[PDB]
Design an enzyme around this catalytic site. Structure first.
Site, mmCIF file in Angstrom:
data_model
loop_
_atom_site.group_PDB
_atom_site.id
_atom_site.type_symbol
_atom_site.label_atom_id
_atom_site.label_comp_id
_atom_site.label_asym_id
_atom_site.label_seq_id
_atom_site.Cartn_x
_atom_site.Cartn_y
_atom_site.Cartn_z
ATOM 1 N N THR A 17 0.771 -0.941 -0.022
ATOM 2 C CA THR A 17 -0.420 0.125 -0.143
ATOM 3 C C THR A 17 0.699 0.905 0.315
ATOM 4 O O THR A 17 0.615 2.644 -0.267
ATOM 5 C CB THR A 17 -0.937 -0.348 1.928
ATOM 6 O OG1 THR A 17 -2.013 -1.262 1.611
ATOM 7 C CG2 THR A 17 -1.763 1.331 1.291
ATOM 8 N N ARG A 147 -6.708 -5.018 -2.238
ATOM 9 C CA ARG A 147 -5.947 -5.814 -1.463
ATOM 10 C C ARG A 147 -5.563 -7.375 -2.578
ATOM 11 O O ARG A 147 -6.212 -7.734 -2.798
ATOM 12 C CB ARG A 147 -6.728 -6.947 -0.681
ATOM 13 C CG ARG A 147 -6.233 -8.127 0.223
ATOM 14 C CD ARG A 147 -4.588 -8.039 0.794
ATOM 15 N NE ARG A 147 -3.736 -9.004 0.892
ATOM 16 C CZ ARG A 147 -2.922 -9.416 0.729
ATOM 17 N NH1 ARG A 147 -1.844 -8.240 1.024
ATOM 18 N NH2 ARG A 147 -2.191 -10.581 1.524
ATOM 19 N N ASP A 169 9.927 -3.905 -2.752
ATOM 20 C CA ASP A 169 8.929 -4.432 -1.249
ATOM 21 C C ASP A 169 8.926 -6.164 -1.524
ATOM 22 O O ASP A 169 8.988 -6.624 -2.700
ATOM 23 C CB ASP A 169 7.386 -4.064 -2.087
ATOM 24 C CG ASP A 169 6.266 -4.775 -1.875
ATOM 25 O OD1 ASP A 169 5.529 -3.970 -2.408
ATOM 26 O OD2 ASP A 169 6.474 -5.469 -0.572
ATOM 27 N N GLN A 173 3.949 -13.393 4.202
ATOM 28 C CA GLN A 173 3.879 -14.921 4.501
ATOM 29 C C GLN A 173 5.358 -15.155 4.767
ATOM 30 O O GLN A 173 6.383 -15.568 4.033
ATOM 31 C CB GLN A 173 2.884 -15.184 4.000
ATOM 32 C CG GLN A 173 1.428 -15.031 3.761
ATOM 33 C CD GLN A 173 1.565 -13.719 3.081
ATOM 34 O OE1 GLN A 173 2.322 -13.285 1.958
ATOM 35 N NE2 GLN A 173 0.556 -12.708 3.466
#
Ligand SMILES: Nc1nc2c(ncn2[C@@H]2O[C@H](COP(=O)(O)OP(=O)(O)O)[C@@H](O)[C@H]2O)c(=O)[nH]1
Ligand code: ALF
Ligand SMILES: [Mg+2]
Lengths: 318, 136
Positions: A17, A147, A169, A173
């Site tokens: 974002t 998303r 970026d 996870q």
């Protein structure tokens, strides 16, 4: 002069974002064709969001306000498997809007912390009608709110205050973290994102693990790494806007049993801030700056990135 | 013989993600892209899945068994990004291995690429050139 920047943080903390805001602030934002490529992503989040809420109804054994809604739920589940991915037919949005207005759906929505729901569920669902209005074109905020799980490592470049930023970026996870080691060399600064609102949520990877504890373990491991002792480390306590709202209904003692302060943005916010900064083994010599941020808020991000840029600029002339 | 896709063919890899991945040269060109973004494990897992469902059914228990070891196991070398729900359902079916066991896992990794990786591919130089070197 060039600067290598690292956006690190657990899954769904706000990294990508931020990238989107850099594009909006130092890259001439999006074109009409790009804005439109998000419509499908938005319809995709919307559906997945209402579906999760629906399934939670039985998982949490919550019943519909009006029994009729039960069919709407069943027919939605069906249309989910038959329509084209990333679309939103009238008959579908009609079903979604009726479920949304249901008092039981809302009750389950209010219990989002008890299952896995997208941050933007309430954002889109609340204004579905606007999203499916003929001629619809995503707004910046609509894009910012979108998303998409990111996988791998992606670089984006921009200039600012006569500095060539090479911003990397990554994925958050657990499985993606083993790939981070490929970027540790020559890191000028690390922006580490932490979801303030993760204190009562569990990981998507392991629903037994609290999201903030996971975040704390991650940051602990990053800020204390030989590859960054000469790297600027800025902490982004993110999702302030979501955090200042749930802290009014959900006690931070869920994450920290020992917390005895009031459950208000300010006090709980600072308590979380401290738990992370106190993970530093060498804060003696290396200071870690931190800003309360809302990655979806362009002004806040433009402000915070200007400050981050000053830190970089200053730590450089030393 | 070499395989040099035509203008149209390369152009239609941008019509939908399945078109790009159902094409051998598409995947091949798509792999050079993921390698750069360090996410080539996803396309590898996908193929592996195909090779399990549409391959010699004689060694399924053998393949799945090693697929789990290479892509699913904790800290696995080509560890893939799937959620816990999708991961348990999978580890469950691997107690009675069969052809469509990796379905859930595969559908997941498919969309992962489709929404994130794919998008950036049609924009990369690795695609613009593939298109520039198009026949007629
Ligand atoms: N309200 C709100 N949403 C946010 C904020 N930051 C990220 N989000 C949303 O949370 C989801 C995850 O963010 P994303 O950038 O993909 O996170 P990351 O890539 O895991 O670090 C997206 O739907 C965003 O729009 C925030 O500060 N406030
Ligand atoms: F950490 Al993510 F999409 F979950 F970038
Ligand atoms: Mg991301």
């Amino acid at each position: 002069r060039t600067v290598k920047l690292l956006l690190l943080g657990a899954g769904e903390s706000g990294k990508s974002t931020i990238v989107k805001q850099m594009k909006i602030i130092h890259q001439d934002g999006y074109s009409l064709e790009e804005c439109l490529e998000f419509i499908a992503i938005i319809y995709g989040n919307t559906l997945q969001s209402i579906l999760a809420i629906v399934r939670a109804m039985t998982t949490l054994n919550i019943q519909y306000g009006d029994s009729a809604r039960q069919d709407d739920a069943r027919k939605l589940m069906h249309m989910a498997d038959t329509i084209e991915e990333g679309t939103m037919p009238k008959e579908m949005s009609d079903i979604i809007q009726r479920l949304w207005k249901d008092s039981g759906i809302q009750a389950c929505f209010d219990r989002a912390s008890e299952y896995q729901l997208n941050d933007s569920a309430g954002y889109y669902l609340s204004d579905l009608e606007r999203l499916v209005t003929p001629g619809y074109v995503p707004t910046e905020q609509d894009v910012l709110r979108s998303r998409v799980k990111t996988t791998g490592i992606i670089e984006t470049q921009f200039s600012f205050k006569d500095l060539n930023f090479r911003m990397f970026d990554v994925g958050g996870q657990r499985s993606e973290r083993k790939k981070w080691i490929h970027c540790f060399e020559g890191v000028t600064a690390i922006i580490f994102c932490v979801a303030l609102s993760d204190y009562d949520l569990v990981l998507a990877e392991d629903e037994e693990m609290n999201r903030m504890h996971e975040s704390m373990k991650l940051f602990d491991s990053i800020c204390n790494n030989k590859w960054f002792t000469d790297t600027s480390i800025i902490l982004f306590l993110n999702k302030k806007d979501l955090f200042e709202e749930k802290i009014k209904k959900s006690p931070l003692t869920i994450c920290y049993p020992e917390y005895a302060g009031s459950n208000t943005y300010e006090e709980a916010g600072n308590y979380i801030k401290v738990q992370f900064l106190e993970l530093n083994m060498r804060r003696d010599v290396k200071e870690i700056y931190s800003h309360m941020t809302c990655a979806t808020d362009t002004q806040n991000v433009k402000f915070v990135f200007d400050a981050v840029t000053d830190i970089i600029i200053k730590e450089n002339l030393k | 013989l070499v395989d040099i896709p035509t203008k149209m063919r390369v152009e239609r890899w941008a019509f939908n993600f399945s078109e790009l991945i159902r094409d051998p040269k598409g995947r091949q060109s798509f792999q050079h892209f993921l390698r750069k973004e360090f996410s080539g494990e996803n396309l590898g897992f996908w193929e592996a899945c195909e090779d399990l469902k549409y391959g010699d059914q004689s060694k399924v228990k053998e393949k799945a068994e090693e697929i789990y070891k290479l892509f699913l196991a904790p800290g696995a070398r080509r560890w893939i990004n799937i959620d816990g729900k999708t991961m348990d359902i999978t580890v469950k079916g691997l107690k009675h291995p069969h052809r469509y066991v990796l379905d859930a896992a595969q559908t997941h990794i498919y969309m992962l690429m489709k929404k994130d990786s794919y998008a950036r591919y049609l924009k990369s130089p690795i695609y613009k050139e593939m298109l520039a070197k198009a026949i007629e």
